[PDB]
Homo-oligomer: A and B are copies of this chain.
Amino acid sequence: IDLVTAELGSDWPRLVAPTFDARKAVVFDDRWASAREDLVKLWLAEEX
């Protein structure tokens, strides 16, 4: 492991560490909810 590090360097092994996992995903399929709140904000704040 010392020899492998000697060739590749310090940053390469540390940055190659895994990140992605299947449980942290977030899905936004709602327009219906966000469109309603979007309109009432326009309606109340109307100036121009």
**Which A residues have a C-beta under 8 Å from some C-beta of B?**
1, 3-4, 7, 13, 16-18
Residues on B with beta carbons closer than 8 Å to the beta carbon of A3: 17-18
A4 contacts which chain B residues (CB < 8 A)? 1, 4, 13, 16
Q: A7 to B16, Cβ gap below 8 A?
A: yes
Taking the nearest CB of chain B, how far is it from the CB of A16, in angstroms? 5
Chain B residues contacting A7 (CB-CB under 8 Å) are 16
Query: How close is A34's CB to chain B, nearest CB, in angstroms?
Result: 40
Cα–Cα, bound, A1→B13 (Å): 10
Which residue of chain B lies nearest to A18 when distances are taken between CB atoms in the complex? B3
In the bound complex, CA of A1 to CA of B17 (Å): 12
